[PDB]
From Swiss-Prot, chain A:
This is V-type proton ATPase subunit D. The chain holds residues 150 to 198 of 247 of the full protein. Belongs to the V-ATPase D subunit family. V-ATPase is a heteromultimeric enzyme made up of two complexes: the ATP-hydrolytic V1 complex and the proton translocation V0 complex. The V1 complex consists of three catalytic AB heterodimers that form a heterohexamer, three peripheral stalks each consisting of EG heterodimers, one central rotor including subunits D and F, and the regulatory subunits C and H. The proton translocation complex V0 consists of the proton transport subunit a, a ring of proteolipid subunits c9c'', rotary subunit d, subunits e and f, and the accessory subunits ATP6AP1/Ac45 and ATP6AP2/PRR. Interacts with SNX10. It comes from Mus musculus. Subunit of the V1 complex of vacuolar(H+)-ATPase (V-ATPase), a multisubunit enzyme composed of a peripheral complex (V1) that hydrolyzes ATP and a membrane integral complex (V0) that translocates protons. V-ATPase is responsible for acidifying and maintaining the pH of intracellular compartments and in some cell types, is targeted to the plasma membrane, where it is responsible for acidifying the extracellular environment. May play a role in cilium biogenesis through regulation of the transport and the localization of proteins to the cilium. It is found in: Membrane; Cytoplasmic vesicle, Clathrin-coated vesicle membrane; Cytoplasm, Cytoskeleton, Microtubule organizing center, Centrosome; Cell projection, Cilium.
UniProtKB/Swiss-Prot annotation, chain B:
GO terms for cellular component: apical plasma membrane; clathrin-coated vesicle membrane; cytoplasm; cytosol; extrinsic component of synaptic vesicle membrane; melanosome; microvillus; myelin sheath. The chain holds residues 257 to 506 of 511 of the full protein. Kidney; found in early distal nephron, encompassing thick ascending limbs and distal convoluted tubules and in the alpha-intercalated cells of the cortical collecting ducts (at protein level). Expressed in epididymal clear cells (at protein level). Mainly expressed in the organ of Corti and spiral ganglion neurons, in both the early postnatal cochlea (P2) and the adult cochlea (P30). One of its GO terms (molecular function) is proton-transporting ATPase activity, rotational mechanism. Disruption phenotype: Morpholino knockdown in the whole cochlea, especially in hair cells and spiral ganglion neurons causes a dose-dependent hearing loss. This is V-type proton ATPase subunit B, brain isoform. It comes from Mus musculus (Mouse). Non-catalytic subunit of the V1 complex of vacuolar(H+)-ATPase (V-ATPase), a multisubunit enzyme composed of a peripheral complex (V1) that hydrolyzes ATP and a membrane integral complex (V0) that translocates protons. V-ATPase is responsible for acidifying and maintaining the pH of intracellular compartments and in some cell types, is targeted to the plasma membrane, where it is responsible for acidifying the extracellular environment. Keywords: ATP-binding, Cell membrane, Cytoplasm, Cytoplasmic vesicle, Hydrogen ion transport, Ion transport, Membrane, Nucleotide-binding, Synapse, Transport. It is found in: Apical cell membrane; Melanosome; Cytoplasm; Cytoplasmic vesicle, Secretory vesicle, Synaptic vesicle membrane. ATP binds at residue 144. Its main location: membrane. V-ATPase is a heteromultimeric enzyme made up of two complexes: the ATP-hydrolytic V1 complex and the proton translocation V0 complex. The V1 complex consists of three catalytic AB heterodimers that form a heterohexamer, three peripheral stalks each consisting of EG heterodimers, one central rotor including subunits D and F, and the regulatory subunits C and H. The proton translocation complex V0 consists of the proton transport subunit a, a ring of proteolipid subunits c9c'', rotary subunit d, subunits e and f, and the accessory subunits ATP6AP1/Ac45 and ATP6AP2/PRR.
Amino acid sequence: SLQTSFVTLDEAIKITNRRVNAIEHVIIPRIERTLAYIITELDEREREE
Amino acid sequence: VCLFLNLANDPTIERIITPRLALTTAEFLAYQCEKHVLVILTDMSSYAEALREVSAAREEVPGRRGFPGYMYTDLATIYERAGRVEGRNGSITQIPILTMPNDDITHPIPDLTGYITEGQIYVDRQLHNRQIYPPINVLPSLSRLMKSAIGEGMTRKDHADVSNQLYACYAIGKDVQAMKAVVGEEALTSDDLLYLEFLQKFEKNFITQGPYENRTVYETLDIGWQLLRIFPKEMLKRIPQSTLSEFYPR
Amino acid sequence: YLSQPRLTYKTVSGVNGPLVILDHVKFPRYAEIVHLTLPDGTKRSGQVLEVSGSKAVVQVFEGTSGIDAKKTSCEFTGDILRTPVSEDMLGRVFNGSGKPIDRGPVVLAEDFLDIMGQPINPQCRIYPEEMIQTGISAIDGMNSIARGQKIPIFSAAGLPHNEIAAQICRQAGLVKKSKDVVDYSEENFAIVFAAMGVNMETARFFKSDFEENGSMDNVCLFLNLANDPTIERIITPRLALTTAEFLAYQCEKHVLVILTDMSSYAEALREVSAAREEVPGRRGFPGYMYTDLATIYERAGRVEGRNGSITQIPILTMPNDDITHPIPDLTGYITEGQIYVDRQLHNRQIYPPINVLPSLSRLMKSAIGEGMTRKDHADVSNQLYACYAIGKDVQAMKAVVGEEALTSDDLLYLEFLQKFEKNFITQGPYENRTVYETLDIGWQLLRIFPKEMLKRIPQSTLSEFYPR
Amino acid sequence: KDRIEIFPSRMAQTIMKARLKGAQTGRNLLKKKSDALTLRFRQILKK
């Protein structure tokens, strides 16, 4: 019983770790850069007026 | 058929009068010859551009995006030339079109056009990218008068609920596509595969018509029901059981 | 002093918007108060905005409407605005302009002062040396307010910050009673409250509540409904501050000024700027908003050689709950400390919805101490904060880890969370808790665990307080 | 790819800040699950 649980829990940990890693090294920088660009554009538009 | 062509190499300023002549002729044909007429105005973006140019020439105090503040008033003067009249028989049915700068819904021109007129059809780009024609996204399309223009005798007792339910299924299907993009099939279940299949067959059978495909409204409701049959009658909530007891089984 | 007769003009070279331009005025000066009389007999006040040779411009307070060219009198005063300050103003109620509205008499002025005030010498500043009690257990225990500290209260549209303000008003005071009540009877504390940019329901609610609490004998009240002229919005604070100054440094009292809805102040100032034709600054707000809020906030503290103090608790709303909006940004920069309210906590039906996790303070270390309070305060605060943070993040953990894998100590942390939100924070509108009651409840909540988990408390105080 | 396709605006600033906050909360919640899973792994291999 112990060994069965171990063998399945290994791949469970692997998929969870892959998900958290992909989340922390793909989407967050992308959103942050988009927000930087948005702030810049808003500033431009106000200054023209 | 009567025309008013204004090519792109013509003088720019005469755009501000071109639609007015057409609408004046339309009013005459509506209320002096008692004929039902359909108006079509094209490339209103150029019309807005001409207004911008004449305004910037006069050095007036400007508005959003460089456009004059009074755009809404002028567009109100142009669009409200439509409707029917007591004691008369003719009518004006106006269908303008316009282009979207950079596909931004919140651009001032389309915003004001949605605000004055009665909704949108929204030829969508992504559907066109998949060779779909007419590439129209039904989800943002709005038509206020449709609610009372349908019913028993006018079109049929069986019009509204089909429409509302199909709208709801489309919305939920796009939601499922978004959630799949977030995660994937691993956490989903059978029903999500069904909704995605529904989306596929709805973009296959409902929207896509062809350059000469002339459909009839009763046949259209038949197709709507054929699409609705993909699911059980129980999962549907918008449609009362009353219509299902008469038109679901087949 | 002044003995010359006043002038009056029947010259109107034009009117535009909220302004009235005239000319042929003899030796005009800036910021001179001007009266007006219309054809129909109405009287309106105003101020001088622009002056250029014999040309003058006056912004009419009450709003321009129906001012003829030829039939209009315009008397001049020759003096800047001056307030009739007086100690006896306590127990009264006024409008923005200072006219009484409670069926009472005009103030028999005891002294006249400049509305603008004067900067206070940094040499004669005195650091705060002691705390106060506001009546809120959540605020006193977790976040001390010294004498002379400037702590704002960030809120948003749709929250019950006004009720919190009223609660603070009807219960604010001192805790000198540590040693004896006999020496505590010498009370010299008062409150001045400036409701500004307030709708009618809230104005009536304030008046009724203040009258109900029975302590109106030491409360001055200023009201400026949103109907009243927009310029009176930016004159109410100056009157309130001048009164607070006169009471603090000429009566040696301990005054607590509470300002409401500084966003409306900002909006009124914006409108004045735009009417004055000046170029806009950042976000449409004027550039010198920083200097203006500075000259409003900086009138407080303590003065060497005078037994008195001024404490400021401004309130304001954050548009769109945006913490980087300029108004809260500048307010945070100028002032010391900050207190939050959180939407979720109000949405948990918890009153007062005070979110202590992002709430800070700047003078807590020196406001409290042996003598002025018990010796068991700072460690208790640190322990409560640490326990609560553990409990909240631990609830976040159990949300996915499952409640079955939790240890028993984990259940103790959850128990601490629920009891802390059930009793310490929730008080009810009239449960007047003191500081000592607050620390009693804090120790009782800490009793759940053994002293071993309580690793922020020194063992010396553990041998004394923990086994109670 | 490097920028989520939307027209810049203030409303867009609100929605993107909200989406960033959602991603952060998801990351923290995943970290907690990973903590529990590695605890189970260690306790299984304990003895």
